Design a protein around this nucleic acid. Structure first.
Ligand code: CL
Lengths: 347, 349, 345, 348
DNA sequence: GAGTTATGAAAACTGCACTTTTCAAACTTT
DNA sequence: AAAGTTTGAAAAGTGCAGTTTTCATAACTA
DNA sequence: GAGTTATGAAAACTGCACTTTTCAAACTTT
DNA sequence: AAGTTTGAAAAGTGCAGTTTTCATAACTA
């Protein structure tokens, strides 16, 4: 059903009401692929509708995110920040929901996104655009008439070079690891280095995703739409580690043919993987702007284009939906325009 | 017979009433071709003629499926999940409780899907959607009051959201070797080897091999012609060179005499009845692991893909693929007509 | 937006009301790509926006079809014939629209489709299914309740073989033609034989659809989705005829680079093309079950699979969306299953 | 600002009022990069407010398009057609659906499309749909009563290989035909130079027509040509001098007698820039003469030819993007695309 | 020990609604 | 005719709203 | 003359709903 | 060891529905 824009006497509570409706809608529309507990999500939907305060909305959205509904985090906090800005006590422009305009929103962004990055500022703006677009489509009185806001509010990533990649690979075997985790951790990080696959892609690998032929592994990676993409790496890079780890793995209560697992048998967390990557980066003395697994992913793509000069190959290997993403790992010398002008006089 | 939409005071109980009617209709409309015990299905239909609880509906449909009515599994579980959802959600979705079946709309169904399909495959989501669409399409067509007028749901759910796994010629050779090389007990070795080999060479489906009968085997010009029963009184044929199974077939038929099988069924369990896909899969996967060919799919159907692929690589005849596999549509046969190594070598000089 | 099932006291008149609504909807949903006069369509929709008699519905739907809205012809006549059936049976024995069921519809099909082909019978049934499906979706009373019908009502085509094709080609040049039409007609029919393109495809060909390279023409054929498919043809088959006709073509007031045209300068009709093809068929002594341009299309597809045994090749050349369509030009020998069993060796 | 949905007695004239409001907004939001004489546009923005007839609105939209505001053409004509539909349908049929703006819905719009897009291409139909959706989305966001409440249409409408080019051998024949075909002494040097520059660099029609001599820089036998883009941004292409050396010097001498405006390299007899229409005619004329007539016979087809050849020669997708000036690599990817003889030989 | 849970912040993607452009017949001028 | 321009028509091209994931640290358990 | 207009009939396609099956972990029996 | 039950994940297809052409009559030029 639809609701009138203003149902309550208190404008701040009415704003909170629309924010709750919006965040609840997003919980039902955003991806649920990583939801671990279906029952917690169901509870969240009801608890969002029963919420009467900002702190309550915050708690339930956190509950939703921690249950596997990751996408909600981008929308929740920014809108709760705006509610705080709107509800702030003042003396002597905030007595109605219809007073909210682009002037007010611009002021809010300026105050609340001061020491935040440009990317974070973008997220805040997107969240605002989503909320008021929702309100415009869902508010309505008995005359089937509505109030309309119409709010619009109108290069190489950090990486390791070839030589630094060599040192990093050496450091994986040179750094100290306990006997319980050394085989597993070295295998996990090296696969990421040699394939450039994402963090969650590596942590969710299965044994049956692996096939060996002519001294080279083909690894299938499950993606969106349940579509698989393939990556290849030479067997000798991980043959010794894989043989060693599979033996140790037999002592674990591992579930669903999962390759990497903790002692309990479940998949490792991003937090654990990051710290294992970062401490090796430190040991190698290679600390920079970014120091995690995705930084290694940027490194593989950069090296791939440097070695092969094939943009399509980068797209297919990295799993980019568009070549415009693959472009980020390239730089064009303007003098090379001469190569295009020379096609008429040489093959 | 048509019924009024709401005959009870409890909407949750009224929902159960329509679900039971729908599931009984599907049992009579969906294929009963694979049903062995007809009496069991009749008993199921008898129970579904009365009002049943959720627990009772679950038990009945399971009994029907295990009897041979396979199609019911696609509709049964998702709708029982929705009843479970509706019984608790109708009270706490909003401040005011949903006290009527008319409160069920497209938004509610969308929310049910998002919650109950979290973490499941895209294919599973589609099955749930199809199940929900079928139920309320049925209600729209079978409900009416005294004046022959009906309530219409009109649920639409407009939101809807390479080469298959196989073994190449070299891998197929290694698999055939492993069939004879792997350890099997004397009681099942002859039967299982013959069963799996026929699948590999002909590419017939699992149930087709499990339902093979002795009278459908003919030998001429050093080649077998195997007839496979299809829809109704239809039969499709496959051919297989004699020397591939002639030794095994003779050996198995001898040992088959010790089994208490009541008919001319070729393959049978220790009790005499037909083997299941579950046992066939386990034996196939076991040989695959032994050969080190473990991958995305490790069943008999993967061997079926391997046959279709190899057939197209050797003859390049799409019509031949259709006739050999028994495809009704050439859009299926077309599938078997479908530079990462360069990226993997960058680490070397 | 929606109307009660029964608004009038007379059931027969109320039936015409729903038929008129359905036919108006189809004039809005069916393809208008072939419409030549937009003003005629404008007049048709205006007339269909009110209550019409049976004769009026027939006249208006005919006007729409003749204006280029071809699809409407499949729905109009069968439904108007049902109204005639309903009116007669009501007076002889039907008190309400609710009385219409599958038993009644089955009897109608038995009486009115007698002597007609199975394909024609199928068209009648499809029209009935469309009407009552529409009514089920559009009827509603003041209480938001509706009546539901739920009506369900539950080998190689004629061609010329290789030898007959050769005789037909010779007959095109051998038969007598007027000097004013000979060059154009010979080229038009030969292109159909050599490419197997549809009738309307040949009639709407443009000069710039032709490109010549290394003694071979590539003809681009515009089809569904406004997408083009390519067919190739050896130059020596039509190059002389093409050069001759283009010269003669300069005498015509033809526009938009249209290849074939009448003396007025516009595209030729299907009626003229059929009669030209048919008289050559009769002259060659090749008359059979089908004698038009589409029979030549079936002949091309049959020959293509015969000489190449490539089903994909047939699909792409003929412009089939699915391979199941191309299948009808194939004949599988059941003994060839041994060829599939010998792949292991 | 915002206005009440219904201010006029005649809903037909009220419809035109909203259409005029919408088109004026598009004139101020769509690109004004190709706009020379900005005062002519400010003139149009005023005449858009004053337009109270279909003829007045049609005239100013054409005036705006001529001024360089090209994007308006996609929206103006389809909405002028709908106004024509609404107007005559109301006066003739007198159906209740035309007695108020509120009675316009998806059904009415569907009937309009079936009538006014009959015999038209699918691409054109998509343009008509976009224009209709844009109009009523604008009205939903700009209408208000005294109590700041709005009527909402929420209109939704049901949805509806290598590009044509010359290969390397065909490009050779085309280049020869440029010099072989007959041209008058007045235009031969100008036309040959203009077309050859397009062939060798693959730049767009408008880019070539707006070239200026000051943006040319010769160094060691190779030209660097700057091409003006959006804002203050320029892109560059390179061109070997021997391709155009003779033609360039010859044309510049003839150019001395022209009353050239804005320091343009190419111009008409009056001194102003040549149009795409004239450029197309000259290219098509050579194409026909060379016996290369195909599905597309303009300068953009020559552009497709350059990109296709460039990728076949070097297999460098980034090089293609930079040389052609593609903003998106999805466009550059098209030139990586691509057994019909096997079916044509069945008659032998 | 060998890892997890929680979290504000900062990206890392994805695709289509919409913008921007030329095609090419009809028309006008010198 | 040569030398152009106007115009309906038909695309050709892409910026940015919107979705999904990781960064990188604190607080746990011992 | 060389074609068009009109028409009931007879196809010639096109595409996606939804029916039917196996996968494969968990569970049971001889 | 030798099986079956079961939630889950596909594998596969018949038919509603759309868009032509067939083939003849009746014309005029
Ligand atoms: Cl590249």
């Amino acid at each position: 059903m639809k609701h009138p824009l203003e149902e309550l006497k208190d404008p701040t509570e009415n704003l909170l009401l629309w924010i709750g409706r919006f965040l609840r809608y997003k919980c039902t529309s955003l991806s649920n692929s990583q939801v671990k507990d279906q029952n917690k999500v169901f509870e969240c939907l009801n608890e969002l509708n029963q919420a009467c305060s900002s702190s309550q909305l915050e708690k339930v959205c956190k509950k939703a995110r921690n249950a596997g509904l990751l996408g909600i985090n981008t929308y929740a906090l920014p809108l709760l920040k705006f509610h705080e800005y709107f509800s702030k006590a003042r003396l002597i422009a905030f007595n109605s929901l219809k007073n909210i305009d682009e002037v007010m929103l611009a002021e809010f962004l300026s105050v609340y996104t001061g020491g935040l990055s440009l990317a974070t500022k973008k997220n805040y703006r997107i969240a605002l655009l989503g909320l008021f677009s929702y309100i415009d489509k869902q508010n309505q009185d008995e005359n089937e008439k509505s109030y309309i806001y119409n709010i619009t509010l109108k290069k190489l990533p950090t990486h390791l070079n070839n030589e630094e990649l060599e040192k990093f690979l050496e450091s994986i075997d040179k750094i100290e690891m306990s006997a319980k985790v050394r085989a597993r951790n070295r295998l996990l990080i090296k696969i990421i280095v040699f394939t450039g696959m994402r963090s969650n892609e590596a942590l969710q690998l299965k044994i049956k995703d692996f096939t060996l032929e002519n001294g080279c592994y083909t690894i299938l990676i499950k993606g969106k739409g349940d579509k698989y993409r393939a990556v290849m790496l030479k067997a000798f890079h991980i043959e010794s580690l894989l043989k060693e780890w599979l033996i140790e793995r037999e002592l674990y209560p591992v579930k669903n043919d999962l390759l990497f697992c903790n002692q309990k048998g479940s998949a490792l967390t991003q937090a654990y993987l990051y710290k294992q990557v970062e401490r090796i980066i430190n040991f190698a003395g290679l600390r920079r702007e970014k120091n995690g697994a995705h930084m290694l992913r940027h490194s593989f793509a950069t090296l791939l284009y440097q070695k092969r000069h094939d943009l399509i190959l980068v797209q297919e290997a990295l799993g980019h939906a568009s070549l415009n993403t693959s472009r980020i790992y390239t730089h064009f010398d303007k003098q090379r325009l001469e190569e295009a002008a020379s096609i008429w006089e040489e093959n």
